[model samples]
Target: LTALSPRRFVVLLIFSLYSLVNAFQWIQYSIISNVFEGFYGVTLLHIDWLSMVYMLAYVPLIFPATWLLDTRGLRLTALLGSGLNCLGAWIKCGSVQQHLFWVTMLGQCLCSVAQVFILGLPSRIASVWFGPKEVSTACATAVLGNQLGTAVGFLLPPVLVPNTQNDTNLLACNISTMFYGTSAVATLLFILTAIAFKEKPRYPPSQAQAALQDSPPEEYSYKKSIRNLFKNIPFVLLLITYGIMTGAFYSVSTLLNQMILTYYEGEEVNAGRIGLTLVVAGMVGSILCGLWLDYTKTYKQTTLIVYILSFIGMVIFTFTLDLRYIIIVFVTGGVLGFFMTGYLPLGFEFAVEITYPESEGTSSGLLNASAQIFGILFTLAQGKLTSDYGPKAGNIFLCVWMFIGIILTALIKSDLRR
Candidate 1:
């Protein structure tokens, strides 16, 4: 019930919608890989590297973005971020040069800079408006945008846009158009949200904060935060767990098209269809976990069980060789999405439980930065691995990371619930 209050409801809806748009910016890389190969003679591994560079740029931008949010509040940071993201999308779609890949990567780097604002703000908002007990549920609701965006990205273009006559060149141009178009939509929504949005009023006004009366004095320095992150055994462990899980999961995200084509001998449209299962499963898992965490009050148990289930899924996914075993792969993808993406809210919930009351924004920002860095690392590693041994080996490599994640997560000794 606390999670469903009208103001919280508005925040959740806006957060989810905006996140969907944000996530779509990332998803296009994977979906359009085949097009790039056909149009520009780019190899699959090269496309993977492009995705990697996008994320590599994304990792460092988080620090400054979070700092700005803390200083300027969500409205300014979010509005500017959306503008950058839209700008990136336009450049990516409009380019016709042989160096389109580099140009697009540059655009994504710009988007990455904007994304810092988008990614960090929701957690801060959740920490501010939602009581401790409801924070995880609220976070879960906010990230529903990501899963929904994944579904839309996978489904929309394949169905609506026809491939180019020269499938490669045509596909490239079409995808660029799609990116420009979607960025426009995202930009419009972001402007509306900026106009309507208000950060929580629970804390003293900015004037009061300046006067230093009732508001908690801001104490954590960004440098100190980084040092603490390195020294924090539990946080580091969580970082490793997330890193491994994400590497494995990102292999799926980055290589989905190739996997479908090679395994199922399916066309592009058919390849995109497998993403539907991932989307459906993730959406169900996110909403269910959000409601369950709210109702059951067993945040720790929920996370633990999900981790174990994800481990089992990863194990099943690793050894299945036969094409008939595709069912297992699908199921594994679903389970992995549930645990990997769904864990964000649970992690934030734990952050609040462990942090000083005033430091939630900074803590959440640092935690998320680690997560994004892991994603970049995994993407980079997967690109290299695929270039060497081929995609199947890449999946096996990811499975190894998943195994490490399970062990690291099992080692989290603190009681997860406050």
Candidate 2:
């Protein structure tokens, strides 16, 4: 029992590190929006594309990526993801040095493609690498690594890069330096993953693990798995609800600086601070919710409670932005983060529970694809609203969608009997 623990942790840590690098690259532009815009002469739409490309790239590649993960296994997929991330980060560094906008977009596109391999694996990784009792916790822990990276992305850029008020030349120099630094980290993690990650446990850790290692092997066919997923009503509903909530979260991360800075102009640091608070609160909530789900097996109840709380928090945030009360901003942001962001692992685990014997990668990939579609839609729409009306209008738009998601979530039946 203890023997497997060491190997399990090693694998989890490697995958988590991959997740961290993946997120760090994704959120880099949004966190440092001021510098990117001022130095590069790019507009808000260009910044939106930097993040939107991640979703768009995933939409087309996720099915293939899921097929690869299910058939080819974890180690090869991990190596592929880490390698692409490293390559993409270095490419972005080159763009910064040359001051090429298209080059940066090209690099972001590569990173976005790499995300297909990383984001869909958390649930599958937990199921394959961990025992039954620790599955949800393991999933949450893996996801926490990604959230930690986003939190770091939110905090680091504001500190590392200067604000728009600085000399354009100096700002460009700092931004370029930041890119090189991130590329170095990405390259180091890639080498570590290549060396340390193993395909599977030598001995099965649980009955499910034992079953997965049967003599003939449990082969997964992409078409069959997809067909089965569509047949599951509960899964389809969860997909939509999860997509809506996640889309809102993605929009907030991408548009946070624009929304806050509208009223609090010249507060890039404060925007980063609030973004960090939101992610940290969400990380804690994810772990707590994962534990609750594992112990009580109350996926529906847990999800609903958080969804409702998140809705209230979003409402408060929309109304309070202009008030500019620091405590209120932090409190509401934290509340929104705690529930909305925390719901991520719950959504993944719940999908797996309902669609058992199906590949975890298939289910999660579909969920992620749904999120990207909605994230793109919401980000564009909310960005427009902010530009035309105010940040409050965008928040209101998110609130309406949140209510719709609540209704859809309520309709999902929690029978895991499949």
Candidate 3:
């Protein structure tokens, strides 16, 4: 029970794809919030709620989802994520009728809960199916699928459903086109996962997993797992800084459209394009970062360096926002994204390294919930600051947190368990 299997790709790809689908739906509206305002007859903040619901739901449902992943195993976890995500997509399709905002809200909520399952999976899958050298790469590819989806989400929506200028008919039809496409993808992913997704490889993919295989099952305690993670100072620091860094990402992404509109008027399409810039650059950054970790195996040095760059990147992006040169803005945004979004998988992979033998699901789930909680708080406060002052002020607000994140990232001692 200690050999690699080709079908490891099968499980990771299937799960990664479903994660992509869920991510696609998460930002479908917010990227084109102005168009949605005209289409749905709701204000921008109400549209913000659609994206916010994901973070809001993550906290309450995360523990239960983690419990399921631990006790029932991976197949059931994948099943629930896919099945519920598919159900949510279909429900959203049904709610495209003007004024059915509440229905769509409920749908996104279901998918948000489903996200709890998806977010905790990368590290678990890596350990179950990959060796030390490729675990970070595997984890990166897993989140990459989701990140790619977000990139597409940012690219696709504004073009796919331009503002109808009060023409209700086109708005309704275009939204249906978007939602139905999501539903179709969800359907295919759910079916494929049902047929192909396995909980683990036939043989252990690494020494750690083999050790886990031989350990007495009854010795793993949920309460002790919670206590263990809480007691680890390094984990606590990671939890906070990851929350700050990622929470700022959540704020920046949700409000990117409004932020762009204030400076570059009538460029919603370019707003989405700028978003695509950051996301795709970040995806590449994560991939390169994954390979770097596999080679260096130095999480603390890498994490701290990336965190410092994120702050610097944020500072640069904030200043460049009003430069009126779209190309410069685009490059700056990607530079910002290169480190900022790149930091995500590093945190997850590093968390796994530090908390080795603690349930990967619990550790990752805790990290995600921390990000979600911060996402909500950061978005709320940043949203207010953006409205009162301007997007520059909001970007500055995130920059402050990103600076704190740099200092905090420096404090964690190098302690790779796996």
Candidate 4:
């Protein structure tokens, strides 16, 4: 293993902040769904769209984003991502000035476009920038940046906006201020990225990375890489299972406020509290899982454990939300978040393991695309279920999918020797 370099840390830090801003913008509406609905005079559908747009935009754009990263490389991709993120944050603030819902939506759409550049690059970036010994941990830490931002998104809005019943003006003012704060943070990060983000180190950072660097460059073609991926049954299974896991995560994140309010109405603060708990647990789980994977290289074992635990957490949450015990709710949410979010970096690394020699960006991009497809479908379906049958029905809907994911995870076969 090569000595870990300062340049590697700097590149990861810049890209991680880009990831952070992307998620912060993505979940801005989700934590305070009720507030957004009241302040903007919109339905769940409109609020759902704000979060759903991230997945919607990613599905189509991930291919092009991957191509850009593979062909043009990391520095260009990071700059594009940061530039769009900063612009999107400011655009969102513009919506606040006019109190226009469409403006906020448009700004979110831009940030969704920005997500294509940051979300799928963690694995590829880790492989290219860090030593093999540190790749999994590096990837987890990068992913943690986004997860931490999501935690903040869930935690901040309730505190900032509060549950101002019948006070749209006050809610609007708080919302605008939140946007300004996030936009300023994004702007600062953009400058840092432009000044510090490097494409790759001068020398390869690990033996495996050295081997990859020494290898001949293949013709960069998205279609061909995707076709090859489709042929690998193990990889295809991993994609499907991972997608199901991620889809569930997205559903819960988008609809958590709605779900909680169904049983515990007027508890938007509690909803945010639950969300913060879940994400923080997930962050810890992600770090521990990353270390375990790096130590044992047991991707399949680690993922299966997370999948089963997450399934149990979903089942418990589905039945117990009506109990109204704050402690139970927070604990279950934390457990679910721990396993579900933690599995993300594992999925990225495992996909690369099963599909070695294929670009990590391609594998991660396809994984993300599958997740987005599931996310959009689940969000729409869950939204409808919540509207018609109530949030319990939606929770049941998610539980069914989680059951499917567990079965699929059982079916996946990985040859760790890779």
Q: Pick the candidate with the highest lDDT.
A: 3
- Which digits, one per residue and each the tens of the lDDT, describe model 4 over residues 1-418? 3556778888888788778878978887987888788677788899999999999999888887777776787888888888899999898898874248898999899899888888867777888888777887787788888888898888888889887857667766887899899899889989998888777787888887778776847567779989999999889989998888898889899999888888887788889889989889988887776566555557788778788988888888888888978789998998888888878777777886898878777787889999999999999999899889988898899888888888888788874732
Give TM per candidate. 0.83, 0.93, 0.92, 0.92
Residue-level lDDT tens digits of model 1 in 357-406 = 33566666666656666666766676667657766676666766766666
Worst 10 residues of 2 by lDDT: 211-220
lDDT of each: 0.63, 0.83, 0.86, 0.84
lDDT of 2 by residue, 1-418 (tens): 3225567888888788878878988888997675687666778889888999998999889987876876777888888888898899888888864258889999899889888888867777887778888886787788789899899889888888868445766777778788889888889889888787888877777787776577534456777888888889888889999999999999999999888888886778878889999999988887676456555447787778789998998998889988977678888899899898988877886886788878666787788899999999999999999989999889999999999988988988875321
Question: Candidate 4: TM-score?
Answer: 0.92
Report the lDDT tens digits of candidate 3 across residue range 301-374.
Answer: 88988899889999999998889877888988999999999898788878877887787777877888899999
| lDDT, model 3 | 0.86
lDDT (Cα, 0-100) at 417 in candidate 2:
21
Deviation in Å, model 3, residue 248 alpha carbon:
0.9
Question: What is the lDDT, from 0 to 100, of the residue 38 in candidate 3?
Answer: 72
List RMSD in Å for every model shown: 4.3, 2.5, 2.5, 2.5
lDDT score of residue 168 within candidate 1 = 53
Model 4 stretches astray by more than 4 angstroms: 1-5, 97-99, 206-218, 290-298, 415-418
Model 4 — which ten-residue stretch has the worst lDDT?
289-298
Evaluated at residue 213, the lDDT of candidate 1 is 34
For model 2, what is the alpha-carbon lDDT of residue 236?
Answer: 89
